[PDB]
Every structure is written in structure tokens, then in C-alpha cells.
């Protein structure tokens, strides 16, 4: 069974304490005792559960920088394999 | 068919209408067009077409098909 700690310390759980109101008066002789904890989870207003809510640019920047590094590395590798320091650009390029 | 309720937790596409579908269509069409434009350029680098009308292939030109010199 799960044994982790629900009471996290890194942040406070977003909760709505007004959705359920515990009864505090007018109890009958056969009614059950009320419930102490009635807070419910409160999701962000702009939350869509059907998609990734990833709104950052870290993954895109990482992939773009990796692709740019691949491009410059290929340029240098081609320059070295041709025995030059930089690629010599021909005045005309034709279809292969 | 008569509409029937769909569970809220189920990520199914039954009678799904997005009120903001116009911007979604914009941002799913135009970048797709750009991606296909880039792929089109890349594939047009390697593209072959026969000679046009009034043009013949010189058999001794480098363009002409070649045979292996053993």
C-alpha cells in the first residue's frame, strides 16, 4: 500500500474550504456526528485536464539548441572531412 | 442518434465541440503548412523531371546515362 506523506512541505495544497460546511447546530438524537475535515481540492481556473498543461519553453529551447548544435557540428565535420577550415560554397547547386 | 450523457472523466471524442476551435484551426493549419513547406524544399532538392518540349538529351553530355568502365 502507499505510505507517502500527504502533508507536503514544499507547497500548500490548493483547497476550497467553503464547498462543504460541517453541521454545528440542530443535531437530532439519532443523527450522526459531523465530519471534521471538509476541504476539497481547488484546481486552477485555466486548467485543462484533457491536454498537457505545459506552458514553459524549456523543452523547445533544449531541442532547438540541440538541433543548432547538430547543424554547426555537421558544418565543421564537413569542413574537416573536405580538408578545409570552412565549407567552400559553390556558385551553383544542382539537384541530386 | 439521440444524444446520451458522456462521463466527464473519459477523454473520448463523442459530441465534443471546442468553443475556441477557430484559433486552434489557425495554429494547427499554418505551422503544418510551414513544416510541409520545409519538407517540400528538402524533397525538391532531390527531384527529377524529363526534358521539356523541344529539348533533347545529348548522348555525350554528362547528364546522359552512363555505363560502368570495368
Amino acid at each position: 500500500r502507499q505510505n507517502f506523506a500527504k502533508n507536503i512541505t514544499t507547497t500548500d495544497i490548493p483547497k476550497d474550504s467553503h464547498h462543504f460546511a460541517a453541521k454545528r447546530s440542530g443535531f437530532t438524537q439519532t443523527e450522526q456526528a459531523p465530519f471534521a475535515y471538509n476541504d476539497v481540492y481547488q484546481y486552477p481556473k485555466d486548467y485543462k485536464p484533457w491536454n498537457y498543461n505545459y506552458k514553459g519553453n524549456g523543452v523547445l529551447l533544449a531541442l532547438f539548441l540541440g538541433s543548432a548544435f547538430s547543424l554547426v557540428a555537421y558544418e565543421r565535420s564537413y569542413a574537416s572531412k573536405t580538408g578545409r577550415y570552412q565549407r567552400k560554397v559553390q556558385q551553383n547547386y544542382y539537384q541530386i | 442518434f439521440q444524444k446520451y450523457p458522456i462521463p466527464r472523466y473519459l477523454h473520448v471524442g463523442q459530441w465534443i465541440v471546442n468553443k475556441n476551435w477557430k484559433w486552434n484551426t489557425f495554429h494547427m493549419f499554418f505551422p503544418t503548412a510551414i513544416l510541409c513547406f520545409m519538407v517540400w524544399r528538402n524533397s525538391m532538392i532531390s527531384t527529377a523531371k524529363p526534358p521539356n518540349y523541344g529539348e533533347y538529351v545529348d548522348p555525350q553530355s554528362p547528364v546522359a546515362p552512363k555505363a560502368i568502365k570495368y
Binding site: 507536503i8 481540492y41 485536464p49 | 472523466y9
Partner: protein, 54 residues
């Protein structure tokens, strides 16, 4: 058609809904399986890009 109810007045014309996966959005566990698999994907993609693409 004869008697058509528009989207606004339709009581069963669903807007997009449903949970994308079985992961709890309000999960408090320090679960790292998703992060490990994302790391595997990203590092594999980078290794292909940074070693093999050209």
C-alpha cells in the same frame, strides 16, 4: 433539419473534457517514473541529434 438544438442550448453537446492520463493532477507523491521516461526520451533524441544526425 426539422427540430435542431444548437450547441449552446444542447444539454449533451460536450465541450472537451476527460483526464488525459491516469496521473492525478493533485497527486502529492514524489513520483519520478514520468520524469525518468521523459529524460530517457530527451537524452535519446539529443544523442541522435548530437552524434548521428549528420
Amino acid at each position: 433539419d426539422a427540430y435542431y438544438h444548437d450547441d449552446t442550448h444542447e444539454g449533451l453537446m460536450n465541450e472537451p473534457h476527460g483526464y488525459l492520463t491516469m496521473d492525478d493532477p493533485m497527486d502529492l507523491r514524489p513520483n519520478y517514473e514520468k520524469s525518468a521516461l521523459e529524460l530517457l526520451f530527451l537524452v535519446s533524441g539529443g544523442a541522435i541529434l548530437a552524434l548521428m544526425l549528420g
